[PDB]
Short mmCIF file of all heavy atoms in Angstrom, two decimals:
data_model
loop_
_atom_site.label_atom_id
_atom_site.label_comp_id
_atom_site.label_asym_id
_atom_site.label_seq_id
_atom_site.Cartn_x
_atom_site.Cartn_y
_atom_site.Cartn_z
N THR A 26 30.23 6.38 -17.43
CA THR A 26 29.21 5.45 -16.98
C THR A 26 29.35 5.28 -15.48
O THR A 26 30.31 5.76 -14.88
CB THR A 26 29.34 4.09 -17.66
OG1 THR A 26 30.63 3.54 -17.38
CG2 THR A 26 29.21 4.24 -19.15
N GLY A 27 28.39 4.62 -14.87
CA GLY A 27 28.45 4.42 -13.44
C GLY A 27 27.19 3.77 -12.91
O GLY A 27 26.43 3.17 -13.66
N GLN A 28 27.00 3.90 -11.61
CA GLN A 28 25.88 3.31 -10.91
C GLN A 28 25.21 4.38 -10.07
O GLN A 28 25.90 5.18 -9.43
CB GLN A 28 26.33 2.19 -10.00
CG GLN A 28 27.21 1.15 -10.63
CD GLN A 28 26.58 0.51 -11.80
OE1 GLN A 28 25.38 0.26 -11.82
NE2 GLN A 28 27.38 0.20 -12.80
N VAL A 29 23.89 4.40 -10.06
CA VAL A 29 23.13 5.38 -9.29
C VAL A 29 22.12 4.65 -8.43
O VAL A 29 21.55 3.64 -8.86
CB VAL A 29 22.44 6.41 -10.20
CG1 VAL A 29 21.45 5.74 -11.11
CG2 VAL A 29 21.77 7.46 -9.38
N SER A 30 21.91 5.14 -7.21
CA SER A 30 20.98 4.54 -6.26
C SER A 30 20.10 5.62 -5.67
O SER A 30 20.59 6.68 -5.29
CB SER A 30 21.69 3.83 -5.13
OG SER A 30 22.40 2.69 -5.58
N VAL A 31 18.81 5.34 -5.56
CA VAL A 31 17.87 6.26 -4.94
C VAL A 31 16.92 5.48 -4.05
O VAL A 31 16.32 4.49 -4.48
CB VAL A 31 17.09 7.07 -5.99
CG1 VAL A 31 16.37 6.16 -6.94
CG2 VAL A 31 16.13 7.98 -5.30
N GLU A 32 16.80 5.92 -2.80
CA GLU A 32 16.07 5.19 -1.78
C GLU A 32 15.06 6.12 -1.14
O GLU A 32 15.45 7.10 -0.50
CB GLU A 32 17.02 4.65 -0.72
CG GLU A 32 16.35 3.85 0.36
CD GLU A 32 17.35 3.33 1.37
OE1 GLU A 32 18.54 3.70 1.27
OE2 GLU A 32 16.95 2.55 2.26
N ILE A 33 13.78 5.81 -1.28
CA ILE A 33 12.71 6.67 -0.80
C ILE A 33 11.97 5.96 0.32
O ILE A 33 11.53 4.82 0.16
CB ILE A 33 11.74 7.05 -1.92
CG1 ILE A 33 12.50 7.74 -3.03
CG2 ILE A 33 10.72 8.02 -1.41
CD1 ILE A 33 11.68 7.98 -4.22
N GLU A 34 11.84 6.63 1.46
CA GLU A 34 11.02 6.16 2.56
C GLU A 34 9.60 6.64 2.37
O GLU A 34 9.37 7.80 2.00
CB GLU A 34 11.57 6.67 3.88
CG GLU A 34 10.80 6.22 5.08
CD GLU A 34 11.41 6.73 6.36
OE1 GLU A 34 12.39 7.50 6.28
OE2 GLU A 34 10.94 6.35 7.45
N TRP A 35 8.64 5.77 2.62
CA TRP A 35 7.24 6.08 2.38
C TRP A 35 6.45 5.95 3.67
O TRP A 35 6.81 5.20 4.57
CB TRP A 35 6.67 5.15 1.35
CG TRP A 35 7.28 5.29 0.03
CD1 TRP A 35 8.36 4.63 -0.43
CD2 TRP A 35 6.82 6.11 -1.03
NE1 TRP A 35 8.62 4.99 -1.72
CE2 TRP A 35 7.69 5.91 -2.11
CE3 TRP A 35 5.77 7.00 -1.18
CZ2 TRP A 35 7.53 6.56 -3.31
CZ3 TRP A 35 5.61 7.64 -2.36
CH2 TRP A 35 6.49 7.43 -3.42
N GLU A 36 5.35 6.69 3.74
CA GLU A 36 4.45 6.66 4.88
C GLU A 36 3.12 6.12 4.42
O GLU A 36 2.51 6.68 3.51
CB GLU A 36 4.29 8.05 5.48
CG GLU A 36 3.50 8.09 6.75
CD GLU A 36 3.36 9.51 7.29
OE1 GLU A 36 3.77 10.45 6.60
OE2 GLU A 36 2.84 9.66 8.42
N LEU A 37 2.67 5.04 5.04
CA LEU A 37 1.47 4.33 4.61
C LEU A 37 0.33 4.62 5.57
O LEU A 37 0.54 4.83 6.76
CB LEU A 37 1.72 2.83 4.56
CG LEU A 37 2.83 2.39 3.63
CD1 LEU A 37 3.05 0.93 3.83
CD2 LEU A 37 2.42 2.65 2.22
N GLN A 38 -0.88 4.63 5.04
CA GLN A 38 -2.07 4.75 5.86
C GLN A 38 -2.79 3.41 5.79
O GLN A 38 -3.39 3.08 4.76
CB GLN A 38 -2.95 5.88 5.37
CG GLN A 38 -4.03 6.26 6.32
CD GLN A 38 -4.80 7.44 5.85
OE1 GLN A 38 -4.52 7.99 4.78
NE2 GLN A 38 -5.77 7.88 6.64
N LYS A 39 -2.73 2.65 6.87
CA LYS A 39 -3.25 1.30 6.84
C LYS A 39 -4.76 1.31 6.70
O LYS A 39 -5.45 2.18 7.23
CB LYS A 39 -2.85 0.54 8.10
CG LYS A 39 -3.47 1.11 9.35
CD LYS A 39 -3.03 0.35 10.60
CE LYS A 39 -3.62 0.98 11.85
NZ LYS A 39 -3.17 0.28 13.08
N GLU A 40 -5.26 0.34 5.96
CA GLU A 40 -6.69 0.24 5.70
C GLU A 40 -7.37 -0.39 6.90
O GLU A 40 -7.03 -1.50 7.30
CB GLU A 40 -6.91 -0.58 4.43
CG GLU A 40 -8.32 -0.85 4.06
CD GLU A 40 -8.85 -2.09 4.71
OE1 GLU A 40 -8.03 -2.94 5.13
OE2 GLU A 40 -10.08 -2.25 4.79
N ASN A 41 -8.32 0.33 7.49
CA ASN A 41 -9.07 -0.16 8.64
C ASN A 41 -10.55 -0.03 8.33
O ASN A 41 -11.09 1.08 8.35
CB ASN A 41 -8.71 0.62 9.89
CG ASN A 41 -9.33 0.05 11.12
OD1 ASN A 41 -9.59 -1.15 11.20
ND2 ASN A 41 -9.59 0.90 12.10
N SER A 42 -11.23 -1.15 8.12
CA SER A 42 -12.58 -1.12 7.59
C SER A 42 -13.37 -2.31 8.10
O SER A 42 -12.83 -3.41 8.24
CB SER A 42 -12.58 -1.12 6.07
OG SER A 42 -13.89 -1.23 5.56
N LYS A 43 -14.64 -2.07 8.38
CA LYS A 43 -15.56 -3.08 8.87
C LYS A 43 -16.43 -3.66 7.78
O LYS A 43 -17.40 -4.36 8.08
CB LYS A 43 -16.41 -2.51 9.98
CG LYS A 43 -15.60 -2.04 11.14
CD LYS A 43 -14.85 -3.15 11.81
CE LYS A 43 -15.78 -3.94 12.68
NZ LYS A 43 -15.08 -4.95 13.50
N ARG A 44 -16.18 -3.32 6.52
CA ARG A 44 -16.90 -3.93 5.42
C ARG A 44 -16.92 -5.45 5.56
O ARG A 44 -15.90 -6.07 5.85
CB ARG A 44 -16.24 -3.54 4.12
CG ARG A 44 -16.75 -4.30 2.96
CD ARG A 44 -16.10 -3.86 1.69
NE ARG A 44 -16.53 -4.67 0.57
CZ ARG A 44 -16.31 -4.36 -0.69
NH1 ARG A 44 -15.67 -3.25 -0.98
NH2 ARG A 44 -16.73 -5.15 -1.66
N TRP A 45 -18.10 -6.03 5.39
CA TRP A 45 -18.24 -7.48 5.54
C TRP A 45 -17.70 -8.23 4.33
O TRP A 45 -16.84 -9.09 4.46
CB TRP A 45 -19.70 -7.83 5.78
CG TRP A 45 -19.95 -9.28 5.91
CD1 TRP A 45 -20.48 -10.11 4.98
CD2 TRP A 45 -19.69 -10.08 7.06
NE1 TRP A 45 -20.56 -11.38 5.47
CE2 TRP A 45 -20.08 -11.39 6.75
CE3 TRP A 45 -19.17 -9.82 8.32
CZ2 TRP A 45 -19.96 -12.42 7.64
CZ3 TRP A 45 -19.05 -10.85 9.20
CH2 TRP A 45 -19.44 -12.13 8.86
N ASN A 46 -18.18 -7.90 3.14
CA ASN A 46 -17.91 -8.67 1.94
C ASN A 46 -16.50 -8.39 1.43
O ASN A 46 -15.83 -7.48 1.90
CB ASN A 46 -18.96 -8.35 0.88
CG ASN A 46 -18.94 -6.91 0.50
OD1 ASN A 46 -18.39 -6.09 1.20
ND2 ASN A 46 -19.52 -6.60 -0.64
N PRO A 47 -16.01 -9.18 0.47
CA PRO A 47 -14.64 -9.00 0.01
C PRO A 47 -14.46 -7.77 -0.86
O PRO A 47 -15.35 -7.37 -1.60
CB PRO A 47 -14.37 -10.27 -0.80
CG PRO A 47 -15.33 -11.24 -0.27
CD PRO A 47 -16.55 -10.46 -0.01
N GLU A 48 -13.25 -7.21 -0.80
CA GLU A 48 -12.86 -6.08 -1.63
C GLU A 48 -12.64 -6.52 -3.07
O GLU A 48 -12.81 -7.69 -3.43
CB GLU A 48 -11.59 -5.44 -1.10
CG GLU A 48 -11.70 -4.67 0.17
CD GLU A 48 -12.58 -3.46 0.04
OE1 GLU A 48 -12.64 -2.89 -1.06
OE2 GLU A 48 -13.18 -3.06 1.06
N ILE A 49 -12.25 -5.57 -3.90
CA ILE A 49 -11.71 -5.85 -5.22
C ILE A 49 -10.21 -5.64 -5.17
O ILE A 49 -9.74 -4.61 -4.69
CB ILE A 49 -12.35 -4.95 -6.29
CG1 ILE A 49 -13.81 -5.35 -6.49
CG2 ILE A 49 -11.60 -5.08 -7.59
CD1 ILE A 49 -14.55 -4.43 -7.38
N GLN A 50 -9.47 -6.62 -5.64
CA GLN A 50 -8.03 -6.64 -5.54
C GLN A 50 -7.45 -6.64 -6.94
O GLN A 50 -8.12 -6.98 -7.91
CB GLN A 50 -7.54 -7.87 -4.78
CG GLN A 50 -8.04 -7.96 -3.37
CD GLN A 50 -7.62 -6.80 -2.54
OE1 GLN A 50 -6.50 -6.34 -2.65
NE2 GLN A 50 -8.51 -6.30 -1.71
N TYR A 51 -6.19 -6.24 -7.05
CA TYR A 51 -5.49 -6.37 -8.31
C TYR A 51 -4.89 -7.77 -8.39
O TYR A 51 -4.02 -8.12 -7.58
CB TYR A 51 -4.40 -5.32 -8.47
CG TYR A 51 -3.68 -5.52 -9.77
CD1 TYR A 51 -4.27 -5.15 -10.96
CD2 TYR A 51 -2.45 -6.13 -9.81
CE1 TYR A 51 -3.64 -5.35 -12.15
CE2 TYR A 51 -1.82 -6.34 -11.00
CZ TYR A 51 -2.42 -5.95 -12.17
OH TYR A 51 -1.78 -6.15 -13.37
#
């Protein structure tokens, strides 16, 4: 038995939008 660790770096694409009305969110 033991312990395992995994660490992932992610690259995000920020949302840039001029839409007036509200989005749909979770």
Side-chain angles (χ1 to χ4, degrees):
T26 60
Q28 309 303 323
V29 62
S30 293
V31 57
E32 182 180 5
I33 302 173
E34 181 178 4
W35 296 89
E36 186 181 6
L37 301 173
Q38 193 175 0
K39 65 181 177 182
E40 177 272 339
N41 187 29
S42 174
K43 300 297 282 187
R44 170 179 176 167
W45 179 257
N46 61 343
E48 289 296 329
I49 291 173
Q50 299 300 320
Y51 178 76

